Symmetry: C3
Subunit: 185 residues, 3 copies
C-alpha cells in the first residue's frame, strides 16, 4: 500500500469520458512531497469525436476539457470525466483493493487556489504546459490545468486541451507533462 501516491494506474485501459463513454485513457500520477503534490499527466484518446483531429473537415473542433471533482474528503465525484473505479492509492502497478475514504493531503490548497467569489480572481490557480501529439515536435497542444474553479465540489483539478494548428488526421495521444501544486494539508 503506497499511501503517498494517488494514480490511475499506468496501464492503457480507457478510464475517461470526454465525448463518449470511456473514449480515453488519462494517465495521472499524484505524488505527495509534503506541502507540494508532484503531478505527471498524459492522455490517449482511443475513439469518438476527439480521437482523430481533422480541422479541414471540422474547423471548430479545437479544444476539450477533462474535469476531476472532489468532495470534502478528497474523494472523486462520479460526475467527473475520470471514472472512479481505477482512481485510487497505489499498490505495485495496480491499486489498493478497496476505495479510499480520505485524500485531503492530495487536494489543491484552497487559500492558494480559492473557489470563485467576489474577491479578485488571480491567475496563480493555473499552470500551462505543452504536450506533443504522436510525440512529434511540430504537433504541440496546450494543456491548461486549473485548480479549484469548478462549482458543485470542494476541490477540483481540470485539464483543458487545445491547439491552434489546423491538424489533418492527427491522432490525439500525447507526450507527458510534469507540474506541481500546493497541497491543502
Amino acid at each position: 500500500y503506497d499511501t503517498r501516491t494517488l494514480w490511475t494506474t499506468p496501464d492503457t485501459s480507457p478510464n475517461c469520458t470526454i465525448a463518449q463513454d470511456k473514449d480515453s485513457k488519462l494517465t495521472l500520477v499524484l505524488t505527495k512531497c509534503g506541502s507540494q503534490i508532484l503531478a505527471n499527466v498524459s492522455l490517449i484518446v482511443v475513439a469518438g469525436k476527439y480521437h482523430i483531429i481533422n480541422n479541414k473537415t471540422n474547423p471548430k473542433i479545437k479544444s476539450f476539457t477533462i474535469k476531476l471533482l472532489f468532495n470534502k474528503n478528497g474523494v472523486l465525484l462520479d460526475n467527473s470525466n475520470l471514472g472512479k473505479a481505477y482512481w485510487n492509492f497505489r499498490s505495485g502497478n495496480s491499486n489498493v483493493s478497496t476505495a479510499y475514504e480520505k485524500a485531503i493531503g492530495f487536494m489543491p490548497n484552497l487559500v492558494a487556489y480559492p473557489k470563485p467569489s467576489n474577491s479578485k480572481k488571480y491567475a496563480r490557480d493555473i499552470v500551462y504546459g505543452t504536450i506533443y501529439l504522436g510525440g512529434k515536435p511540430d504537433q504541440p497542444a496546450v494543456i491548461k490545468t486549473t485548480f479549484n474553479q469548478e462549482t458543485g465540489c470542494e476541490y477540483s483539478i481540470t485539464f483543458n486541451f487545445s491547439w491552434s494548428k489546423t491538424y489533418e488526421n492527427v491522432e490525439f495521444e500525447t507526450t507527458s507533462f510534469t507540474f506541481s501544486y500546493i497541497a491543502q494539508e
Copy 2:
C-alpha cells in the same frame, strides 16, 4: 513543517520591485532530499510594473526580484522579498519564530558557483514561461538564476521579461514549477 520554506499562500504584498510592497511573490520550496522542488507565481499590485502599457512606455520590458541569503540560508534584508513572512510552514501560515538555519534549501555551490573569475556556465539558470491574467497569448519569461549575486553566500533571482507589446495588462501570473540541486 521543517520541510517547506514558503511565503505563505495568501495574497498580502511581501515584495518590493519598484516601490515598497508593490507585489506578492508566492514561492514554495519543498525539500525532496538532494533536490528542492520549487513553485512560483507573482502578483504586482501597484507601482511601475502593475499595469503594463508598451505603446505609451515601450521600454518597460523587464524587472528583477532578488532573494539573497547568508551562510545559514537566512534571507538578507536588501532582498526584494521581505523577511517577515518567509519562513517554514505551519498550516496555511508560518512557524511562530524566524528560522535560524536552512542550508538544506540553498542552491548547491558546486553546481552553481558564486561569481568569480572562473568560467560562468549556464547550468545555474532555469527558464520558464508564465502567463499574465491566465491568458495563453500573454506570456512572460521567468528566468531563474542560482548564486549569481554578490554580497551574499547564496541567492535565487527571478528576472521577468516580455517581448510582446502589452497594452494596459495587469502583471499577475500563472504558476511555474522547477527544481534545483540542494547544497546539502
Copy 3:
C-alpha cells in the same frame, strides 16, 4: 544518500558523444516514491559538438546521449555516460563502492514499454527546451525517451536538437526538470 542517483555536480567530463569524454552530463535523479524527479544539463567541452557552426557544417543539428540499464538498474558500458561517474550521492560526491541495485529509479515498464508489435504511445517521451550559453534566443530541444533502446532492460535517452543556424555557439546549457513514473 539512497534517495538520489547522480553524476556529482562538478565540471569533470564524464560523457562521450562524438569522442572520449567530450562532455559533462549533469544528471540528478531523486526518488520521490512513485515518481523520479530529474534535473539535467549538459556541457560539451571538446570535439564535434563543442562549438556549433552551422554555416561551416549545415547538417550538424542533433545528437543523442543514451543511458542503458540492466535488470538491476545498473548502468551498461555502451551508455554515453561513463560508469565511474554514476552512483548514489554522498555529500557532494559519490559513495566509494559501485551500487548493485537501483530498480526503484528505473522508468516503469508498464507506463513505458519496450518496442514491440503493439501500438506505440507517445507517453514515454517528455519534451523540454534548454538554452545555449544561457541566452534566451538560443534554444535547443531536449527530447527525453524512456525504455526505447534495445540491448538493455531499461533506458533513458536524451536527444538534443536545434533548428536555428548557430554560428560559433558553445554547446553548454541551462537546466531542465522533469519527472517519470518509477518501476517500483
